[PDB]
Structure 1
Amino acid sequence: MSHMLEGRKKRVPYTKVQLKELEREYATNKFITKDKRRRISATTNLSERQVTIWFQNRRVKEKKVINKLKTTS
């Protein structure tokens, strides 16, 4: 609870090593191997199927970008 003033935010992600390992293994190539996706869930503490789902979500969460530049809303 510090940093400069002002924050402008709302819903927060899960963990920094969680979103970091997700966007990393996804930005490195496209998908990771069962042993690799497991390293995530193992480091991120999930259930594998969750990573798999994380990747799909990350595919559903990425599209959210490149669409708020103009903000013609």
Structure 2
Amino acid sequence: GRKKRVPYTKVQLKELEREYATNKFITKDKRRRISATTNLSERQVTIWFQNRRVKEKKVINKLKTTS
């Protein structure tokens, strides 16, 4: 546990981290691959990529134990 709000599909996040770790961002042909697998509309696939950038920032902020 140890979490607040719930996320979407673990498969989506997993593949998101996968492609993200490959470089940072990918082409439309690659995003479409993820979209077809997550049943997304392509557009939101690119949004989640940007969201991943703030995700890591949140982790670094938590790794402080100042509260």
Count of equivalent residues: 67
Q: Deviation string for 1:20-70 (max 9, x for gaps)?
A: 000110011111110100111111111111011110111122211112122
Q: What root-mean-square deviation, in Å, do the aligned CA atoms of Structure 1 and Structure 2 show?
A: 1.2
TM-score, structure 2 normalization: 0.86
More helix by share: 2
In structure 2, how many angstroms separate the alpha carbons of the residues matched to 1:30 and 1:10?
27
Give the SS at the match of 2:47: helix
Unaligned runs of 5+ in 1: 1-6
Q: Return the index of the structure with the highest Cα Rg.
A: 1
Higher relative CO (CA 8 A, sep ≥ 6), structure 1 or 2?
2
Unaligned runs of 5+ in 2: none
In structure 1, how many angstroms separate the alpha carbons of the residues matched to 2:64 and 2:19?
30
In structure 2, how many angstroms separate the alpha carbons of the residues matched to 1:63 and 1:9?
16
Give the SS at the match of 2:14: helix
Identity among equivalent positions (%) equals: 100
In structure 1, how many angstroms separate the alpha carbons of the residues matched to 2:59 and 2:39?
27
**More off after superposition, 62-71 vs 35-44:** 62-71
